[PDB]
């Protein structure tokens, strides 16, 4: 009769106290447990615990569940924060016998009238006012079908907090609505809800109401506890909206769920002007009231719409895959810079279209090179720079605290001594002191200050001055390094939390990729990260003017992703238009805008010479051709001048080339070759697949341009189109084959290794242009440009004044630095398994700017050792030498599983920064498959600046030794120190698992897997009856490193031996560190208690006394491995030994006396009796219950049997008899008897101080003390003893009987002198004396309340050793 309780504890909100480290001590009917340690006032425990107890269901469904959450400081005891006492039967009677995600109150018995001590969210199981004043909105996207231009939206604001929902008035046909309404939320503070849900809703008269956006207001970010505590206030300020893309094409939008609030929004949706105050009364009331004209005038002083100037320098666009057509990049902030509305000036906000080209190993890149496209925008946003200067200062001190923190841990991992790390935490703290004594921006004189700005100003100055005084307290109070470490994360978490600015009305810069009209990949760089301030470097953004590495993501990508789209390096800049002069300090390179015109000519098929025959177009024109533009149509603007003359000009070790194929058929037919069958990468007639040859100085080493199928195509490798009028050629290709299609396109691969005046030509005007004259051309044009640069008296700040141009903007570099990268890739670990053999074939593609390579494949191994250096010869980086050194481009190493058939699969990527050290050591970079880590990689990267730069005209140490020919090896001094170890192995048993895979653990066996040197132990033949391995000793040898960072954790694995190959892998193990593996009998009974009157002269005749343990036995102070699951942790155990060098027993339980019981019954009687459950056996001692006594004398005999480990536990209870009701419980206590046998002392039989054959000290152990010490000599390899009449030898040392009985009476009960002295020697071996356990019980209703004491003593002897002595009476 057993029942089980499942308790799942999720989170807590608004806990009492400050800076706490809470944890939940869940207790079910006296059985205690503990959850995971967490941080802050809002913990996120998410743990699951289980309990079980043996009793009737009528006695288990009345028990309480305890959710006792306490604050647990590292040097302080548990202080109570929450406690409740719900009933198990209130879970059991309800449906599912369970609660699911129920919100719970918290309370404290210090003051129950205080109400909520926070909240909690939990799941059980049983097994067998706010015055929200909304003013206006603007830039709301179209959501009604056209046939007023952009006013196709009917918005109204719905606000829902704490479950109560309200709505605003509808305003039809307006993209800039003017509500000016007040909505009073009746939610009493606090509640279970923390975050406010606000949606603008497009009203529809006939269909369902579409959703515009959803923004969130976290109340803890706008409120404080506390005198420095205030009710949540917000506004009047704009909050930005994010969701689906703005382009209303009709149809169901595939990114519809983005604007419902879930996931990061992909595009700007407008903004809401709103405020909130707390008119908090307990008289709950809600209403929507139209404002008078007085409330509108107060918000107009906050809308100081300054002009904002935006800069974006696109340095590189690499890492690119699945390229379709030319790729351009659009920069926008808010609705300014959205290229689909066609309202902007012809400068627009996008880079020019660029066809990607294959980089030579795996990826593609845009070949910008020395010309970087530039996007410059103008916008109108409010002057919120007082807020942004605050949060850039707080984030700035935060990231120098964080980088200094891992700098301290870097020296600790480098084993620097105590005085170097003293200097590192010293320079951490005084630089923190200078950064924090920097004064905050006063907000008192600024009329754009709201209520929340003034409240955060007092909050920030008070709290950061507390950081200052704590830093001075650590400056003289020199504690230990861990004690300063807990403080170090404390001010870091405080500074990051205070740095939140909920009134950030500046929208994030949404940088986009467009492949045609299709928006593909995005990132929202925050506007605070790039905004400029006049006040200095500490108040500027982190990437304000600095080069920023950005990894774009797909829409609705809640993950880092499997296929990364692209990697960009943008030199973003933002700031005031009056502060745009300060861009001159940040800029580098000759910023240019090319004045341009096109002069066109023609030659038809019957002409033969270039002239004007057949050109129905203007001669001098733009790139469109139809619109005339002469040479002097583009002139220098205000601040510009020409920088040159008119001219006629357009813009490593291995490589891999891609070849292409093309065919055609009729509908209903079969595929045949066309005339254009061997063509170029776009599909037009060029030199064939074999006429493209190797250039001079290189050689082929692939035998043939081979077939390829590693792409998104069908089974035959083709992608298919249909013929579309008016041209004779198809237009849109899709990678599936259907019956309609008339053309198809294939691909190929090969590889190789290293040992007319500027005219452009086209087949027809407006058709496909290229830079060379070939046989298919009949039209042409020439590329006039003249370079224009800003005046030197204004610098590169003059680009922002390019308004009224009617052009491309490009940061031309006259030079580029030359660099040389080496990627020391030694080994990896813990990688995912992808193939059917539970292994993988890892090879790592390593990329750096455009150049990429890949390592060799290590076949069928999850712990590869490539030992390979990928050498990137002559990679060029543009910019200043100092700029690219401090901000190197990000090396991204992604691992892939090689498949001989099919396609390769993703294994995980890591982002690393190359070190400029001349020999930088290896480190572990954690691989991620996006949603989870999938291993670690022992790599290192070295980036060397070379001797000379490569000049672009105006239009190293030795290589390492080779492991294999043409494959470089990671060098000797950088390699980890592998060395020869021989390990002696022990395996003796396993303890304490649960069930696994629909069955119990019947016959487990163990395999040791250190470094691939596999050894296997024997099998525990049946663990449920004996948990013992057959064979003790084993041997193995393992290749192992010397430093614990580089060293592999030990992989052990345990497999259940089930029949016919059906063995389940029931567990694994991970050893984190290896530092541990290099006168009558009643005269004796009352003398032990202390009752002299009933003892008599037993004490005065020099007899012994056993130890009556009035408290529990755990007060006595008297290798082990732990089984590991991947997710919760510790599940079981294993016993053995590793030395690194260069089962049934007889039981006799006696229950004799109890005392200290209370009169539980209201008439004053307590009637106790025992109940002990050991396996199948149960005690039904109600037959001999003792009525109406506080101190009963049971005095009974219980002969029993036990087997390890199912019957190793002794749980004993007491119940009090009742008249008509069920016998109520008194208490319980437990002992685990396995550790008494497991100990090397052999502490099973407690030792009397002298040996006696009979009498009170009559022997009980299976062997006499001489044979016991001889057993100690065989077990611990001590030399065998020699016994005489008077003296006894141990460790060949001579001990005599006068050490025992000097001044003591030689009682006639005493046995042989050999047994007296040998028993004395085991007393010197640390053996416990004789045991009687008078263990205090504990209340199930309260684990801190004792419930009397219960005296007992237990015999336990495994029958294989011998026959124990006969029992005696009590
Ligand atoms: Ca609609
Ligand atoms: Ca509508
Ligand atoms: Ca595979
Ligand atoms: Ca594979
Ligand atoms: Ca009773
Ligand atoms: Ca009673």
Author numbering: 218 to 345, 380 to 398, 411 to 489, 511 to 935, 946 to 1049, 1066 to 1116, 1140 to 1288, 1307 to 1429, ...
From the manuscript:
Ferlins are ancient membrane proteins with a unique architecture, and play central roles in crucial processes that involve Ca2+-dependent vesicle fusion. Ferlins, such as dysferlin (FER1L1), myoferlin (FER1L3), and otoferlin (FER1L2), form an ancient group of C2 domain Ca2+-sensing proteins present in almost all eukaryotic lineages. The top arch of the ferlin ring, composed of the C2C-C2D region, is rigid and exhibits only little variability across the observed functional states. In contrast, the N-terminal C2B and the C-terminal C2F-C2G domains cycle between alternative conformations and, in response to Ca2+, close the ferlin ring, promoting tight interaction with the target membrane.
To understand how ferlins are organized prior to membrane recruitment and to clarify which conformational rearrangements accompany their membrane binding, we obtained additional cryo-EM structures of Ca2+-bound soluble myoferlin (residues 1–1997) and the closely related dysferlin (residues 1–2017), at overall resolutions of ~3.2 Å and ~3.5 Å, respectively. In the lipid-free state, both ferlins adopt a generally similar ring-like structure, formed by only six C2 domains. The rigid Fercore module is well resolved and has a similar organization in both ferlin structures, including the C2C, C2CD-FerA, and C2D domains. Importantly, in both structures, C2C and C2D coordinate two divalent cations each, and alanine substitutions of seven aspartates in their top loops abolished the Ca2+- and membrane-binding activity of the Fercore. To confirm the physiological relevance of the lipid-free ferlin state, resolved here at lower-resolution for myoferlin and dysferlin, we subjected soluble dysferlin (residues 1–2017) to chemical cross-linking in the presence of Ca2+ and identified the cross-linked residues by tandem mass-spectrometry. Mapping the cross-linked lysines onto the cryo-EM structure of dysferlin (Appendix Fig. S14A–C, and Dataset EV1) indicated that 66 out of 71 observed unique cross-links (~92.96%) occurred between residues less than 35 Å apart (48/52, ~92.31%, when omitting the more dynamic C2G domain). Importantly, the existence of characteristic interfaces between C2B, C2E, C2F-dsRBD, and C2G, as observed in the lipid-free dysferlin model, was strongly supported by the cross-linking data, with only five outlier interdomain cross-links being observed, all of them involving the flexible C2G and the anchor loop of C2E. Consistent with the dysferlin cryo-EM map, our cross-linking data placed the C2E domain between C2B, C2D, and the C2F-dsRBD module. From these analyses, we conclude that the lipid-free conformation is indeed populated in solution, possibly representing the default state of ferlins in cells.
